[PDB]
Amino acid sequence: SHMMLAALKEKLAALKEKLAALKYKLAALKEKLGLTPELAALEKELAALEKELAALEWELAALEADPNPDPAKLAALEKKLAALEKKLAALEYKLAAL
């Protein structure tokens, strides 16, 4: 469980850093391309993924505090973070395609 928790925290931190970088890239594209509806949809998505990462971090905080973290809850968190990473990758592509 300890190794699992360490890997999940490292994954969470990595996605948080990517999130922030894309926020600055999106704002730069808004100033270069204008206030386009495509960018509005990407901004909506980035904001939702930011809300989800914050909620997942509360979940990880609880599991790290638990002296006997539930392995199934740990495995399910890995899957949620992997799903979020896929969405963040799809958003990063779209920003790089503008």
C-alpha atoms as a printed R data frame, in Angstrom:
   type eleno elety resid chain resno       x      y       z
1  ATOM     1    CA   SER     A     1   0.000  0.000   0.000
2  ATOM     2    CA   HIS     A     2   2.864  2.362   0.808
3  ATOM     3    CA   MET     A     3   4.415  1.924  -2.646
4  ATOM     4    CA   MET     A     4   0.953  2.288  -4.201
5  ATOM     5    CA   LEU     A     5   0.315  5.515  -2.290
6  ATOM     6    CA   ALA     A     6   3.712  6.932  -3.267
7  ATOM     7    CA   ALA     A     7   3.068  6.259  -6.967
8  ATOM     8    CA   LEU     A     8  -0.398  7.788  -6.796
9  ATOM     9    CA   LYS     A     9   0.926 10.950  -5.130
10 ATOM    10    CA   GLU     A    10   3.644 11.229  -7.767
11 ATOM    11    CA   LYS     A    11   1.024 10.816 -10.498
12 ATOM    12    CA   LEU     A    12  -1.253 13.402  -8.873
13 ATOM    13    CA   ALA     A    13   1.592 15.910  -8.574
14 ATOM    14    CA   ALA     A    14   2.546 15.341 -12.207
15 ATOM    15    CA   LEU     A    15  -1.000 15.977 -13.428
16 ATOM    16    CA   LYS     A    16  -1.304 19.086 -11.272
17 ATOM    17    CA   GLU     A    17   1.874 20.493 -12.849
18 ATOM    18    CA   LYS     A    18   0.591 19.703 -16.337
19 ATOM    19    CA   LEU     A    19  -2.772 21.300 -15.481
20 ATOM    20    CA   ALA     A    20  -1.154 24.585 -14.448
21 ATOM    21    CA   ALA     A    21   1.085 24.671 -17.523
22 ATOM    22    CA   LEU     A    22  -1.945 24.236 -19.787
23 ATOM    23    CA   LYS     A    23  -3.780 27.058 -17.980
24 ATOM    24    CA   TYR     A    24  -0.994 29.480 -18.889
25 ATOM    25    CA   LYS     A    25  -0.840 28.104 -22.423
26 ATOM    26    CA   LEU     A    26  -4.609 28.505 -22.849
27 ATOM    27    CA   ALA     A    27  -4.581 32.103 -21.639
28 ATOM    28    CA   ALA     A    28  -1.782 32.867 -24.105
29 ATOM    29    CA   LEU     A    29  -3.828 31.359 -26.931
30 ATOM    30    CA   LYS     A    30  -6.825 33.481 -25.920
31 ATOM    31    CA   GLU     A    31  -4.722 36.615 -26.312
32 ATOM    32    CA   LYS     A    32  -3.285 35.433 -29.650
33 ATOM    33    CA   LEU     A    33  -6.422 33.988 -31.268
34 ATOM    34    CA   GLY     A    34  -9.142 35.904 -29.464
35 ATOM    35    CA   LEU     A    35 -12.136 34.671 -27.481
36 ATOM    36    CA   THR     A    36 -13.162 31.802 -29.718
37 ATOM    37    CA   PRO     A    37 -15.868 29.264 -28.833
38 ATOM    38    CA   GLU     A    38 -13.361 26.440 -29.264
39 ATOM    39    CA   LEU     A    39 -11.188 28.012 -26.571
40 ATOM    40    CA   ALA     A    40 -14.204 28.461 -24.304
41 ATOM    41    CA   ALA     A    41 -14.875 24.719 -24.492
42 ATOM    42    CA   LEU     A    42 -11.248 23.914 -23.700
43 ATOM    43    CA   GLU     A    43 -11.300 26.348 -20.775
44 ATOM    44    CA   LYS     A    44 -14.481 24.687 -19.468
45 ATOM    45    CA   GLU     A    45 -12.779 21.313 -19.696
46 ATOM    46    CA   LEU     A    46  -9.583 22.490 -17.994
47 ATOM    47    CA   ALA     A    47 -11.634 23.956 -15.142
48 ATOM    48    CA   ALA     A    48 -13.602 20.721 -14.663
49 ATOM    49    CA   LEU     A    49 -10.404 18.646 -14.662
50 ATOM    50    CA   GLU     A    50  -8.930 21.045 -12.133
51 ATOM    51    CA   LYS     A    51 -11.994 20.524  -9.896
52 ATOM    52    CA   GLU     A    52 -11.659 16.748 -10.266
53 ATOM    53    CA   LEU     A    53  -7.935 16.686  -9.421
54 ATOM    54    CA   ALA     A    54  -8.659 18.695  -6.258
55 ATOM    55    CA   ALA     A    55 -11.318 16.174  -5.255
56 ATOM    56    CA   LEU     A    56  -9.040 13.229  -6.001
57 ATOM    57    CA   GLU     A    57  -6.321 14.829  -3.887
58 ATOM    58    CA   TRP     A    58  -8.727 14.954  -0.915
59 ATOM    59    CA   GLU     A    59  -9.325 11.232  -1.529
60 ATOM    60    CA   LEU     A    60  -5.594 10.508  -1.617
61 ATOM    61    CA   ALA     A    61  -5.138 12.541   1.571
62 ATOM    62    CA   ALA     A    62  -7.647 10.270   3.317
63 ATOM    63    CA   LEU     A    63  -6.016  7.089   2.061
64 ATOM    64    CA   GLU     A    64  -2.544  8.294   3.087
65 ATOM    65    CA   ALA     A    65  -3.893  9.065   6.568
66 ATOM    66    CA   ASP     A    66  -5.560  5.659   6.890
67 ATOM    67    CA   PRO     A    67  -3.284  3.191   8.716
68 ATOM    68    CA   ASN     A    68  -4.797  0.348   6.600
69 ATOM    69    CA   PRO     A    69  -5.802  1.896   3.259
70 ATOM    70    CA   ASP     A    70  -8.296 -0.158   1.281
71 ATOM    71    CA   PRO     A    71  -6.455 -1.778  -1.639
72 ATOM    72    CA   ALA     A    72  -9.555 -1.677  -3.841
73 ATOM    73    CA   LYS     A    73  -9.929  2.060  -3.160
74 ATOM    74    CA   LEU     A    74  -6.259  2.521  -4.069
75 ATOM    75    CA   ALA     A    75  -6.691  0.588  -7.331
76 ATOM    76    CA   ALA     A    76  -9.820  2.601  -8.144
77 ATOM    77    CA   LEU     A    77  -7.937  5.860  -7.549
78 ATOM    78    CA   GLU     A    78  -5.230  4.740  -9.990
79 ATOM    79    CA   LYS     A    79  -7.946  4.210 -12.608
80 ATOM    80    CA   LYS     A    80  -9.510  7.625 -11.976
81 ATOM    81    CA   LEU     A    81  -6.135  9.362 -12.234
82 ATOM    82    CA   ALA     A    82  -5.362  7.426 -15.425
83 ATOM    83    CA   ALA     A    83  -8.713  8.509 -16.873
84 ATOM    84    CA   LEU     A    84  -8.031 12.127 -15.922
85 ATOM    85    CA   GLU     A    85  -4.582 11.936 -17.486
86 ATOM    86    CA   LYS     A    86  -6.169 10.757 -20.744
87 ATOM    87    CA   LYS     A    87  -8.518 13.740 -20.735
88 ATOM    88    CA   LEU     A    88  -5.660 16.120 -19.943
89 ATOM    89    CA   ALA     A    89  -3.667 14.616 -22.828
90 ATOM    90    CA   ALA     A    90  -6.618 15.129 -25.165
91 ATOM    91    CA   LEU     A    91  -6.861 18.761 -23.997
92 ATOM    92    CA   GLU     A    92  -3.128 19.311 -24.417
93 ATOM    93    CA   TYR     A    93  -3.303 18.045 -27.980
94 ATOM    94    CA   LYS     A    94  -6.129 20.391 -28.798
95 ATOM    95    CA   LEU     A    95  -4.261 23.385 -27.407
96 ATOM    96    CA   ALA     A    96  -1.163 22.434 -29.421
97 ATOM    97    CA   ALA     A    97  -3.328 22.086 -32.548
98 ATOM    98    CA   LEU     A    98  -4.515 25.717 -32.327
